[PDB]
Chain A
């Protein structure tokens, strides 16, 4: 064993600083050569040579060395790792019966034991006037001798012959007899129920195989009743049945305004029932109508409803940015009810409901305590390199919570002194540490490199100016003047209206009286877009007007973010007249729930809906708002007043049209409708990504190969896309080998950056997809249970900050 080289090549890196670079060099990557995968390493050339000179010595030592030999060297290479990470291989449930009780010498209380097979321990501590008495513990060992449990899959497509695998277990030493039967329902077409006697061996198991073929779509009910020698036990299972194809969600928003305060009148709207072209049959088009009181009324119903929803539930987790979007909508509600002094809404004690909001502002402050490095710097992924983009976004968010939750003083102080002292050039311009790309800017590379540096410093000044009132030292203001000078001396002329607006907003937190400053704001007003005469709507665009002369609808995430930056620089200059068509456009492009398109145009566009919502006073919003179908009767209505304006978003079942009726009244409320169709094909959409996905049989096991390549937009650099998310939906009964996805994100030669298998999806985030060659993901799968009539699944990539730059492919 340990032939000759394994003992010498590991002892050389036994006490090295780059021993971990050698460790993940010797990992098996079959489809990438040694230099091909070494190119994506970015930790300096010292880590590359420790990688490559441990990579070449294992591909040679895998030709004529044994299988038994190399898997002993996999254990000898274990000491090149950092020490064993704290992990537990068990999941203990949330402990029930956690309460205190006043017992007058005898008390009885009843409860249901939870559906788990574990031996509980109930202990009692009695605090009274005599002292403390720890009672003798009792056990609650719920323990069945023969029991089944079924492996009900989470999501079954309609029209598949699902084999429901389950296993009976027999803890008893004597083998015994049993029979399992299944409660047939009207939906389930299964191939009075006969009992056929099978037999488990002693201290063993026995497989149980049924077969269903569901027809109806919804949450069904199947009861598995094992009747062994020790009685009959019914195990109640819920089988969710799901349609086939992609799920498209389209939106629509209307602002109700019976009095026409800030524009033209608006007293009526219809909702056209447009059935699309490539629809699946037999599945209803579902709609949900939501009617909310204030401008922030859609935002309040996110935070005050205990359903536990986020603004961007469609976008995946795993970033540090996704952990800052769990403290933002709690904050912009708390910035409203405290500065505007609106603590007279709640029927509960408002000092108590203030504590539960300050609860979540304190929980969310802990969520990026883990993404902070040792030098108080913030890294995007877990354990990744530090970023000047995230720290400026971590100081923007935390520098705002300080007025309502007391921060740690020194935490911001070493963090602001990391940006100014390490990553700011002589001419104010900042730079980036890692290869993280938050956004993709247009133009060719020498024109873009100036434009990328302008966005990167203008996103930094917002991080400084929101945190300047916490740690106001003399160096971070010494840096701010050349930071403000660089945002003067280079942003005109701007090659993109997106970078022009964030340059104008970042300067709109300091000296607002420069001859160059209002030169920007006049030039920012020059490239605005207007609807109607007088303008009922205003918005902006990513393109300059001279290179692109089009004014479209169904705007993108660059349209809603650039609109909100021009808004907040004109709410800091306090221009009411110019921004009244902007608020009407922004609060109608908002989806249902509070969420906008992406993350970066929700943090910037709820502040615009809160810095303008602190201009509207108590408007007596009390209407008898009624909605109906045209060729049908009304569902219902209710007295919608200031007492209850957070009402429940109603469901629309009948397939007629919709008309929302405000007659007379007073107020300014909003109407939002989400439609949820299921589709068959997607070729009529715009694929901005070359996609191909194959299923191939490797020989070392069925493997799945999926590649992706960014189609560049016109007048862009051909370097590659920004932060993108690969979302392979797995087919039914197929499970992904997670150890093959761990090997793509854990090395120093990582392809992706984070993975998560969530509800049968395979979601992979990534810094960049190139445009020259494809970027392929290779993980093995295995048929977990047999499924006939296998409906094809989908494969979507999309940029994380522009989720409409996408492409979709069906596969099976």
Chain B
């Protein structure tokens, strides 16, 4: 099974036969890719109680002009813009074959490793991507 990353995996087979020695095969590349997705570039570590902005690019590799609702899902160990009963949704159009940087202001509260989950879906269409990534929060 493929993992959830939209990257290019490189598989690498290295054999060992007792009379044929070692043979390192050439790299074979698997190219995981979908058309409407969320790239969540995250820092390696962010400081506890210090307010940081986390951008989330939305790529739209579809020749149609789309309409998308992006929701920053609630987290109890955060102090984000999403309340407990109401999430922080925002709707906007994206042009055909373009990106849209969606910035999310988040100040962490508890140390450790917590989830930053973002869900986005196109209006009256099929494509819909959600991304959960962990965030490293350290004290100092």
Contact = CB atoms under 8 A, between A and B. Distances in A.
Contact of A194 (B35, B63, B124): B124
A193 B126 CA distance: 12
A231 interface: yes
A197 B61 contact: no
B124 A232 contact: no
A230 B63 CA distance: 11
A674 to B, nearest CB: 45
Nearest to A193: B124
Given A195-B124, A195-B125, A197-B126, A232 B34 contact: no
Contacts of A228: 126
A348 interface: no
B34 A229 contact: yes
A231 B35 contact: yes
B124 A192 contact: yes
Nearest to B33: A230
Interface in A192-240: 192-195, 197, 227-232
B124 A229 contact: no
Nearest to A192: B124
Interface string B1-41: 00000000000000000000000000000000011000000
B62 interface: yes
Contacts of A178: 126
A727 B3 CA distance: 63
A229 B122 CA distance: 13
B140 interface: no
Interface string A339-380: 000000000000000000000000000000000000000000
B35 A229 contact: yes
B126 A177 contact: yes
B62 A231 contact: yes
Interface string B55-94: 0000001111000000000000000000000000000000
A195 B35 contact: no
A488 interface: no
B63 A195 contact: no
A179 B34 CA distance: 16
The interface size bin for chain A is 10 to 19
B118 to A, nearest CB: 20
A230 B35 CA distance: 6
> Which has the most chain A C-beta neighbours within 10 Å: B61, B63, B64, B126?
B126
A228 B64 CA distance: 13
Given A232-B62, A232-B63, A227 B124 contact: no
Contacts of B62: 231-232
Contacts of A229: 34-35, 126-127
A194 B61 CA distance: 21
Nearest to B35: A231
B126 A179 contact: yes
> Which has the most chain B C-beta neighbours within 10 Å: A178, A179, A228, A231?
A231
Contacts of B125: 195, 227, 232
Nearest to A197: B126
B95 to A, nearest CB: 14
Contacts, number: 28
A235 to B, nearest CB: 13
Contacts of B61: 231
A522 B125 CA distance: 85
Interface in A259-316: none
Contacts of B63: 231-232
A149 to B, nearest CB: 19
Contacts of B34: 229
A170 to B, nearest CB: 15
A228 to B, nearest CB: 8
Contacts of B35: 229-231
A179 B127 CA distance: 10
Contacts of A193: 124
Contacts of A192: 124
A194 B34 CA distance: 22
A307 B64 CA distance: 37
A229 B125 CA distance: 11
B30 to A, nearest CB: 13
B82 to A, nearest CB: 27
Contacts of A195: 124-126
A232 B61 CA distance: 10
A119 B126 CA distance: 30
A310 B61 CA distance: 50
Nearest to B124: A195
Interface in A64-113: none
A194 B127 CA distance: 13
A232 B97 CA distance: 12
B122 to A, nearest CB: 9
Contact of B64 (A177, A179, A232): A232
A229 B32 CA distance: 12
A229 B62 CA distance: 10
A169 B82 CA distance: 42
Nearest to A178: B126
A232 B126 CA distance: 10
A197 B125 CA distance: 10
Nearest to B61: A231
A173 to B, nearest CB: 13
Interface string B94-122: 00000000000000000000000000000
Interface string A731-765: 00000000000000000000000000000000000
Contacts of B127: 227, 229
B36 to A, nearest CB: 9
Interface string B119-140: 0000011110000000000000
A456 B95 CA distance: 77
B48 to A, nearest CB: 40
B42 to A, nearest CB: 26
A192 B67 CA distance: 13
A178 B35 CA distance: 13
A281 to B, nearest CB: 39
B92 to A, nearest CB: 19
Contacts of A177: 126
A724 B46 CA distance: 91
Contacts of A231: 35, 61-63
A229 B35 CA distance: 7
B61 to A, nearest CB: 7
A229 B34 CA distance: 7
Contacts of A179: 126
A193 B125 CA distance: 9
A261 to B, nearest CB: 66
A229 B126 CA distance: 8
B37 to A, nearest CB: 11
A231 B34 CA distance: 9
A692 B125 CA distance: 53
A177 B35 CA distance: 14
A228 B126 CA distance: 8
A608 B124 CA distance: 69
Contacts of A197: 126
Interface string A175-187: 0011100000000
A755 B63 CA distance: 47
Interface in A624-679: none
A178 to B, nearest CB: 7
A148 to B, nearest CB: 14
B23 to A, nearest CB: 28
A434 B75 CA distance: 93
A200 to B, nearest CB: 13
Interface pairs A-B: 7 shortest CB-CB:
A232-B64, A231-B35, A179-B126, A227-B126, A195-B126, A232-B62, A231-B62
Given A229-B127, A231-B62, 10 more contacts: A178-B126, A197-B126, A227-B125, A229-B34, A230-B35, A231-B63, A232-B62, A232-B63, A232-B64, A232-B125
26 contacts: A177-B126, A178-B126, A179-B126, A192-B124, A194-B124, A195-B124, A195-B125, A195-B126, A197-B126, A227-B125, A227-B126, A227-B127, A228-B126, A229-B34, A229-B35, A229-B126, A229-B127, A230-B35, A231-B35, A231-B61, A231-B62, A231-B63, A232-B62, A232-B63, A232-B64, A232-B125
